[PDB]
Amino acid sequence: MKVEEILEKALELVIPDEEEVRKGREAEEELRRRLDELGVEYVFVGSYARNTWLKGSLEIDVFLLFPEEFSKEELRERGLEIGKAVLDSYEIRYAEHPYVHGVVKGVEVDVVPCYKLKEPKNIKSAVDRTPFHHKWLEGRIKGKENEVRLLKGFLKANGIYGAEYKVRGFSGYLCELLIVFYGSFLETVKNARRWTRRTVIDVAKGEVRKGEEFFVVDPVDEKRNVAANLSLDNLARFVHLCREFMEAPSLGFFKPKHPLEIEPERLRKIVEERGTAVFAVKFRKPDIVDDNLYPQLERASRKIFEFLERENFMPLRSAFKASEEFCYLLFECQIKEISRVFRRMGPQFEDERNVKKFLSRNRAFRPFIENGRWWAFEMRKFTTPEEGVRSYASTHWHTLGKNVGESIREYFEIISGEKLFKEPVTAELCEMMGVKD
Amino acid sequence: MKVEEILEKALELVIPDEEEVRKGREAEEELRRRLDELGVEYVFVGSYARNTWLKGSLEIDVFLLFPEEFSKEELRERGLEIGKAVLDSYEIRYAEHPYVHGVVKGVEVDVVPCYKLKEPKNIKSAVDRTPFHHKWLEGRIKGKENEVRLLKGFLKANGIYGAEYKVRGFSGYLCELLIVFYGSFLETVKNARRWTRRTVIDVAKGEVRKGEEFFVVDPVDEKRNVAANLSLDNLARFVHLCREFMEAPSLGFFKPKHPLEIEPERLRKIVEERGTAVFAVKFRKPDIVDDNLYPQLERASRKIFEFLERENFMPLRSAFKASEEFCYLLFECQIKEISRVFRRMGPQFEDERNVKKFLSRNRAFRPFIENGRWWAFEMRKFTTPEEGVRSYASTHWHTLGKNVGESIREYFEIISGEKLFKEPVTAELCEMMGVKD
RNA sequence: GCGGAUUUAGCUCAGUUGGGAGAGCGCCAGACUGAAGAUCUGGAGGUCCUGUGUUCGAUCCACAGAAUUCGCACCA
RNA sequence: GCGGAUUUAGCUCAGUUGGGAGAGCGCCAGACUGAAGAUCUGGAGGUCCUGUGUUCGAUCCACAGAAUUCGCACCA
């Protein structure tokens, strides 16, 4: 669609200027006031300070640099003293060393105690690194901020922007590092088409090489992978979207695509036509952070997946959804019903000892030999994958993560077909089964 | 049941003396007459000559030794000339070098041209070896003939006596060699409990050792495995029956056990309770020898077995029966119905070339990535193992042996449940599923 | 008939994740030697038995066939 | 919290068919030496991280746990 046109029309949905821009300055000014009132060494960092934040994603990050001659707890008292007096409403978030989150004029503000540490390698944790992150990008990104926003937008539209585990996609800082390295969104897109699972981007030397994993080198600390949270699968998605974009560019790569919103009638048909067993594990949501839940949900999903493999219902895919109330573990298998009878692996014919024991056990059918080894017909306790998972969930809850497993242990349901379609899992089911529009 | 008593009561069902013993002598005498009438060098061998044949299993083996200074075809003319004149009704069976099979007074007689070859290593085929076989066992078996008959009886009662492929069990000559080696049936049974898949019995040296396969050394030619036809599985069966006999001896080890003879009503229930898919491939019997058909049937069964494994209906066992009219390939699977959808293995994400092609193909559902590799949902052409086999039989008949495959190629049926129970396959189905009485 | 095993470099053979065609020996060269050899380096060297099919992709999966090899035995 | 990787002989590590507990090094010995070393032979050497469970059978499969290790990050 001409390429450059859609790049510019995308900006009116990317660039903030819903006149929150000034609300930033207003809060900043106000923030700058009260802060200079207490004579503290302070820095504005993150999205706001570089004028790089997305439309609606307004956030002030304030990092309070504290003398390189104090102690952990002496900065503690301070961050509090300050945060409180400068913010309008507050909470305390402790991380690895605590910080104050609050609100100034409807703008989410992050008041954070730091160190006036000037120059790296003398770093203790991830927090003290962001000032340097800002420092290095400051002045080296000036002018190219729009191109960053395009990248972000591109990634958000297809749901791979973010460092949080719910996404495992691209971190903002990474995006910035990228735009810097290539020159613009596009020159990034072009080269991304040639990325591999072993492609390494050292921004510090301006060099591209092959390593062991996909690695983007932090120009501040060359021991740091900025793209550490980028999952294997997401990276590939990005690469493929870059190949798909260049060949036939369109604006639909920048619009966030919306729910397919189906009726139970069309979904049941798909299932029927698929001839697959579709079911889910429902259980109440344990009240914990997002960056804890999804990892557990994933682990939980995987084990059940692995289970149904062992018991040979042959699952296709697995999916998960977390509402404000419950959690759902979705599964589609190739086997609706398995036989009650199965092969039980018995001893080689020579080990008379073990033979007898194996034979001493009482069964409904005679054991036999095949390839110089005994085998026996025995009975399963479950015939459908629903029945099997029920057995598994009830007996092997503990392995399904700490909080998730406990929530299942205490209670769970298994929902099949028409009943399940009524649950808020429509979107993911379609995504799991790969339904067209 | 006392042990020795049942050994003696078994003999009245083992020792011939249904007064066919004299019919032997009568025919022998008559045979000896006409033969000496033509001045031929002749020998009586096999079961009859040693008085070792089973009750009802009466057969005269006559091997016509011919001068060690003739040629293949010059003996040929002779065997005929002789066979005809001495037998009452005849056929010609060609083997590797032909022979005359016929009847003298209702007794199946085998008139065979040989060589007066005295002493081995100058042998050409299996036929010229039997005189030496008889020669070596003659006089070294005298007195111990009853003990041989016990062994035979033991093996026949449980259906592992015979060198023909329908059985793949113990050859008579082998049994004799055994009784000779240990001393009696029992001393054979005791030691057989300690046989392995690598136990070697050299009768010539009177020695037991370990080799590579189960090997019984022919005292005549030490390059010959007498137990070559003994299948792995049958050997084990024998060994296990020897262990089972010594621990609790009973006469039921000598009675041939009879059909379980079931109704369709009890069989359907078992199937239902088993929850398994049971079906068979029916097709007309190609008119060929037994030692050709069963090998093919086996091969045929196996491939179908292997197929259902590939397509994951997960078969349990496989069985075959050959009537005077049709042949049956019986199968029991763990999967009655499989989903219409399956995983299609696609390329790794890097090989852009192959990616596109894989994606160019049209499907009902979107392809995806998992572990850096593309996968696609596609449709099977069959949902039940019956449907699948139908597809397989029709497309892959040729591999199912020469004659068998051709018979299926031209025609076949697949029969399920109630319909199949009406077919003469009741016994084997019970044997395949391991049903109790 | 019949069945199993085998078929990848000149020789002898590995090769299982369906994506890299390999080792040893032989041959050529380099290093080393006074020489040659022995050792270390390296290089060249291919109809993965043939055909067709399955697959995005084939030494590998399927079918047909070929060749080598061992045995099976019918006979009964 | 949160996740992954790892845990087999004194050290460093193989170990995939669920049935044999292994290699290299180290140590002792034999052979060889004038000696010792170097090489070849061999031997000893084990809580397969623990527990419980599955199985005829447990390094291998399942659950709980431990320890080592790397990273995840929430924060928003």
From Swiss-Prot, chains A, B:
Catalytic activity of the protein: a tRNA precursor + 2 CTP + ATP = a tRNA with a 3' CCA end + 3 diphosphate; a tRNA with a 3' CCA end + 2 CTP + ATP = a tRNA with a 3' CCACCA end + 3 diphosphate
EC numbers on record: 2.7.7.72
Named cofactor requirement(s): Mg(2+)
Keyword Kinase: no
Complex and partners: Homodimer.
Any GO BP annotation: tRNA surveillance
Residues binding Mg(2+), per UniProt: 59, 61, 110
Keywords: ATP-binding, Magnesium, Metal-binding, Nucleotide-binding, Nucleotidyltransferase, RNA repair, RNA-binding, Transferase, tRNA processing
Result of changing residue 50 to A: High decrease in both AMP and CMP incorporation
Similarity annotation: Belongs to the tRNA nucleotidyltransferase/poly(A) polymerase family. Archaeal CCA-adding enzyme subfamily.
Residues at which CTP binds: 47, 50, 133, 152, 161
PANTHER family reported in the protein's UniProt record: CCA-ADDING ENZYME
Function description: Catalyzes the addition and repair of the essential 3'-terminal CCA sequence in tRNAs without using a nucleic acid template. Adds these three nucleotides in the order of C, C, and A to the tRNA nucleotide-73, using CTP and ATP as substrates and producing inorganic pyrophosphate. tRNA 3'-terminal CCA addition is required both for tRNA processing and repair. Also involved in tRNA surveillance by mediating tandem CCA addition to generate a CCACCA at the 3' terminus of unstable tRNAs. While stable tRNAs receive only 3'-terminal CCA, unstable tRNAs are marked with CCACCA and rapidly degraded.
Residues that hold ATP according to the record: 47, 50, 133, 152, 161
Additional comment: A single active site specifically recognizes both ATP and CTP and is responsible for their addition. In contrast to the eubacterial homologs, the specificity of the nucleotide-binding pocket is determined by both the enzyme and the tRNA.
Keyword Flavoprotein: no
Name listed for the protein in its UniProt record: CCA-adding enzyme
